[PDB]
């Protein structure tokens, strides 16, 4: 049986107790799981369903629906790159080239050490600062390869 480490389990419960009904905590719990593991482990959905008092197929459907969640690839840092209209106009392709130069990967790929995954995303709501990316929760305007290299050096 897969079990949640106590420190994760504790955080999950806090979410479950936060809203008036347990099932409202499903996304906060899934965020917490992906934070902890670097992805959503398939084995983690049953225990979570039990904790939410939901059927497993309900949980599985929710994970499938919501694009931030990833059941396939473990990565310590998700580099979310906006590929929508404004970032496209202002230099998404320059940002992607810089990332390939520094990290050796393209959108959808993980570095061989499991450190970085490039995730293409829709508009991140920072369009005046296009082209935009995130590294996990941190968000930045891309200026140049030298600048990006300095930013990425902060994630170890």
């Amino acid at each position: 049986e897969f079990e949640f480490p106590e420190e994760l389990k504790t955080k999950l419960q806090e979410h479950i107790n936060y809203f008036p009904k347990k099932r409202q905590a499903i996304l906060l719990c899934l965020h917490e799981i992906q934070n902890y593991y670097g992805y959503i482990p398939p084995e983690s959905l049953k225990p979570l369903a039990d904790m939410l008092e939901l059927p497993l197929n309900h949980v599985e459907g929710v994970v499938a629906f919501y694009d931030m969640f990833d059941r396939e690839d473990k990565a310590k840092y998700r580099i979310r790159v906006c590929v929508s209209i404004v970032c496209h106009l202002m230099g998404t392709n320059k940002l992607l080239k810089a990332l390939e130069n520094i990290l050796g990967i393209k959108p959808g790929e993980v570095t061989p050490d499991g450190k970085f995954k490039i995730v293409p995303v829709q508009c991140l709501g920072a369009c005046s600062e296009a082209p935009v990316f995130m590294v996990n929760d941190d968000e930045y305007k891309f200026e140049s390869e030298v600048q990006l290299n300095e930013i990425l050096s902060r994630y170890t």
């Binding site: 409202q24 404004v86 106009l89 995303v121 829709q122 709501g125 005046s128 600062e129 929760d137």
Partner: protein
């Protein structure tokens, strides 16, 4: 400490919603209180809920999340139905070009919170929610902390300032779906389900969260409420044109010198937004088009329109994406098609298949790989996304692109030749 946020430029001629949020940092409760914050709430709690509804009605405030429904009227619809009632702040802000709501959240959270409390009191809701998109983690942590400050100071909890009014505000996070900004999909998501829009009517004010009367309002809408109470509805209604009164936030992006959020009255024209406020175009190149988010395409012949909710006005959320003379309209259209492809929820067949095919075929066209049948198919699909649709996404997935086909035929025709 909060996650890194880009420092979006913000400028105001009215010094209301952006009085503090013009400075790119978190303003905590002490700063907010120094500026008279929460005094509007204190005034509101000495008024009847009915009088607050009346004030918000007479202010002429209209929804800022894109549809422009009169806010006081929405509240009135909710309160004619038996409780309990719920209040939801829609912070899903995920339409391309749109970044107005985040700067209130991340810089002046108490303005939003004060507005939520007043609004909840007005409709008799003792439970309120903020639903914030998953890709705004800083905004989430900032709001969680600001709610705790409000609790410390007695603006939340039971028996708020001796009024007998109880309120808790819960903060929920999205997880990647633009459709969860549609108010009924948002409620499904708050209920722990997939973000699938519901047939409406019924509207949330009749049947919403757990089937109870629910008001959904946009962040910016809610941020106006403290001003209506502080100033009174008459003084508020004196701001800007009398038929579309009050401050409005305009997120401007693309090929302008000063992209950012501008707080302006709604008699401002689109030309003024670009040239008077946003510093004109990059390289002083000619404006080719403005995309109103992913909703409408205005040509350079349409810049003298007012930034209001009139039939001939800009409408939407006031989202201004500027394209100039060298920007390829077909390439731009493809990015809009790709958005709708990515965001249809798939419940409705013409929307599901149409959003996919519109993008699939437009990619072929853009890359010079389209057959004659692909061209004819693209035209047909673009016109046939809406039928049987139960929400606004299917109704508008073809709209902007159709406008580009009508307004820029010469550019499209060059892709036809190849």
């Amino acid at each position: 400490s909060y996650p890194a946020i880009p420092r979006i430029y913000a400028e105001t001629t009215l010094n209301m919603l952006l009085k503090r949020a013009k400075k790119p940092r978190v303003h905590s409760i002490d700063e907010y209180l120094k500026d008279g914050g929460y005094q509007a709430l204190e005034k509101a709690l000495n008024m009847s809920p009915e009088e607050i509804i009346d004030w918000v009605d007479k202010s002429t405030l209209r929804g800022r999340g894109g549809a422009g429904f009169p806010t006081g009227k929405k509240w009135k619809f909710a309160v004619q139905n038996p409780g309990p009632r719920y209040f939801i702040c829609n912070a899903d802000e995920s339409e391309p070009g749109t970044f107005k709501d985040r700067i209130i959240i991340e810089r002046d959270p108490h303005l939003l919170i004060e507005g939520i409390i007043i609004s909840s009191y007005a409709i008799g809701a003792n439970e309120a929610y903020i639903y914030i998109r998953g890709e705004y983690p800083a905004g989430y942590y900032i709001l969680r902390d600001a709610i705790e400050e409000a609790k410390k100071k007695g603006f939340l909890g039971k028996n708020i300032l001796g009024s007998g009014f109880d309120l808790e505000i819960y903060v929920a996070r999205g997880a990647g779906a633009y459709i969860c900004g549609e108010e009924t999909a948002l409620i499904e998501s708050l209920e722990g389900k997939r973000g699938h829009p519901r047939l409406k009517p019924p509207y949330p004010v009749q049947k919403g969260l757990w089937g109870k009367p629910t008001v959904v309002n946009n962040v910016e809408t809610i941020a106006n409420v403290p001003f209506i109470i502080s100033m009174g509805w008459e003084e508020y209604r004196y701001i800007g044109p009398s038929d579309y009164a009050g401050p409005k936030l305009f997120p401007v992006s693309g090929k302008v010198k000063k992209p950012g959020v501008y707080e302006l009255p709604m008699n401002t024209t689109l030309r003024e937004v670009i040239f008077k406020y946003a510093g004109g175009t990059l390289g002083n190149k000619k404006v080719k088009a403005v995309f109103s988010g992913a909703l409408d395409c205005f040509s350079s012949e349409e810049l003298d329109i007012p930034m209001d909710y009139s039939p001939l006005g800009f409408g939407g959320t006031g989202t201004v994406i500027v394209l100039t003379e060298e920007d390829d309209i077909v390439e731009a259209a493809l990015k809009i098609a790709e958005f709708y492809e990515h965001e249809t929820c798939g419940q409705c067949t013409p929307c599901r298949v149409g959003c996919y095919e519109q993008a699939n075929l437009l990619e072929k066209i853009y890359k010079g790989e389209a057959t004659e049948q692909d061209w004819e198919g693209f035209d047909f699909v673009n016109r046939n996304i809406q039928p049987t649709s139960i929400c606004g996404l299917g109704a508008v997935a073809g709209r902007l692109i159709r406008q580009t086909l009508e307004k820029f035929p010469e550019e499209w025709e060059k892709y036809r030749k190849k």
